[PDB]
Ligand binder design. Sequence first.
Ligand SMILES: Nc1ncnc2c1ncn2[C@@H]1O[C@H](CSCC[C@H](N)C(=O)O)[C@@H](O)[C@H]1O
Ligand SMILES: Nc1ncnc2c1ncn2[C@@H]1O[C@H](CSCC[C@H](N)C(=O)O)[C@@H](O)[C@H]1O
Ligand SMILES: COc1cc2c(cc1OC)CC(=O)NC2
Ligand SMILES: COc1cc2c(cc1OC)CC(=O)NC2
Lengths: 351, 351
Amino acid sequence: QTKKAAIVELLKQLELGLVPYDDIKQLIRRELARRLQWGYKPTYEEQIAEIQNLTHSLRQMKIATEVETLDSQLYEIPIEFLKIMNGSNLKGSCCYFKEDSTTLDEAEIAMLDLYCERAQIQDGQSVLDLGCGQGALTLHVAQKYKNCRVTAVTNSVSQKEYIEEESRRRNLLNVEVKLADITTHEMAETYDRILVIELFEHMKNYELLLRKISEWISKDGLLFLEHICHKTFAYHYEPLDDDDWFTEYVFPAGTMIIPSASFFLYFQDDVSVVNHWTLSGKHFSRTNEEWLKRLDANLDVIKPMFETLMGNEEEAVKLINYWRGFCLSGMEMFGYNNGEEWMASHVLFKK
Amino acid sequence: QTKKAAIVELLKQLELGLVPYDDIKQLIRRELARRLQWGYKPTYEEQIAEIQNLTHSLRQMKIATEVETLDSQLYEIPIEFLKIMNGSNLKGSCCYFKEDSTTLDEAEIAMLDLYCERAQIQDGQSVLDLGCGQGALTLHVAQKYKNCRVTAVTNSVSQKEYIEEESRRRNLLNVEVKLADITTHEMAETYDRILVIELFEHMKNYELLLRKISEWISKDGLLFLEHICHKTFAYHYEPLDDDDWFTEYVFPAGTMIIPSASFFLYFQDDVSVVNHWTLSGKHFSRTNEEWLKRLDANLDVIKPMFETLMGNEEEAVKLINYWRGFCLSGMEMFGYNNGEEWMASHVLFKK
Ligand SMILES: Nc1ncnc2c1ncn2[C@@H]1O[C@H](CSCC[C@H](N)C(=O)O)[C@@H](O)[C@H]1O
Ligand SMILES: Nc1ncnc2c1ncn2[C@@H]1O[C@H](CSCC[C@H](N)C(=O)O)[C@@H](O)[C@H]1O
Ligand SMILES: COc1cc2c(cc1OC)CC(=O)NC2
Ligand SMILES: COc1cc2c(cc1OC)CC(=O)NC2
């Protein structure tokens, strides 16, 4: 009764930044632990059954609902704010920290290099970057492979822009950006290597999506895929119950899906898995931590920025405290259990 | 829908010189890449079948179409403009760059020397130069082959000009020039060596043309031909689709043909191939590059020249940017993939 009110009192305290970081982390692990209790099953038969029920149900849905409440709540973020929170490459995804001494910028370059290595991109190929974001991978591949023909795809208007100027500003011609919704977009072109970095989490019907992406692959071409995940169970990001405030704490309802590490192994109707890697949840946990440090370290420039974009300081506070919850959610979630619960997954496909 | 209108806007920007060189080359490579995908075939059978479709279709057309409307939009250029863009010999065709420090003038001489070598021109012979242009080849062969008797043929009153005066301005006997349309011209004289440098690209029925040219060959005489090409497929210079702006960007519609390197091996009804060479596309690429440099470097003299030729500044701007797009298309097309796609071909025929 009143602990639903207690829940709607916690969220207000978080919106007003009244709750210390440690207390936030503590409350998060509680909901994380409750998630694991909900996810894990007593027998392995039930565990595999749960993965089957989810894979079968998604094949009845559309490629994606959520599609234009999409990135108005998210991804349509002003570029001037991302250059403060993110690294030099503006990578809005997981970064790779090999040593404790690894900076955010170094971590960004690490993942990008590992992408080219596991996707096996060579100097004379045509590359496709679905959900390119701010073009962290596009600009990186374009410069490192002068004879490549990278093509970035986005449904975001300001994401399509920053790439097109920063590509020309960096002396790059290989770069090409298209404005389209991958859910309903069709193209008669074909590429040697298709790169998808944390895009499927937003989709639903993976059979239809992979069927569409498969047709864009050149023969002897390869499809590389990264997606954050749990190592065992998968599930829609819908609240566990009355007390679950953490699920919809950052991402809007019905916009997220957390696959198991073996999830896309059950979607090989048009593609065939060649190689499969996982990656410690620490890498993303540290990534959000470095993002969090840059927010607090630059509140002097971020605050007036949010005041200008908003209309009042009140909602300028709710916004800065949202991006804190964003970083904090990523920190404690992927760093949970020594980063051996929620983590990243790399899959390499062929035609 | 809006992609058709997006193209006409681009063409207008190019006319008014509002698009930087790098975005132009980038947009060209995209179309170039699109033509390669359209040209290359998955099976060699279909690749050979395409060559046969074009070779057979040409044997029904007339020798040439759009004959004097090709003489109007092009090849009737004021001589004082060519002196600035072209080299010393005014060679309106591919030049030969042996090493990186080769000048334009050196390149013009390099090709001309290579012509006499592969044509095996010797002092006491009668030479015919079909499509002489500004007589870069005629004057060259005429000078230090004093006992030769060069004869230039042109349908351009402007080209029949410069040669004659600049032939006795250098004190030359051999040079003799004719004004006629090769498409319809008959002649009862016969030569020891006929030289055709990039003329067949404007023609259609090669069987009828080579049948006529062969009649002008003295027995034990030779026919040397140079033609730009692609190493594999051939095609009319017509738009791929409505999104293909590059095809009719430089040359007027229906006035161009891009032969295969092996194309004129299929037209040996009256002539017989003796030798066959190709030549890297980097040669003509650098050639158009040197031409482009000479344009921008002499805009202080070129502009007032175009203002005088035209009637207003608006059309003067359109014209200079045309020759810019002329050289830009030449650079990227022949320089594409290290010049191993579109290139030049040399063929030596006997009767
Ligand atoms: N329905 C949709 N259609 C096209 N792009 C979408 C999409 N839904 C999400 N995206 C894009 O996919 C990206 C996922 S976030 C990943 C960004 C980028 N790949 C990086 O690593 O930095 C977002 O930038 C968003 O713009
Ligand atoms: N139908 C036609 N009849 C006679 N000459 C033609 C012709 N169509 C094109 N030409 C000539 O062929 C030339 C092709 S451009 C090549 C010019 C010269 N051979 C050089 O290498 O520099 C043009 O100068 C043009 O005047
Ligand atoms: C809140 O941490 C997350 C960050 C990101 C994703 C998921 C996150 O939490 C599960 C996936 C994504 O599309 N972008 C980055
Ligand atoms: C635009 O580059 C070209 C230049 C020339 C030709 C073709 C070109 O492009 C294919 C052939 C010709 O008759 N004259 C020169």
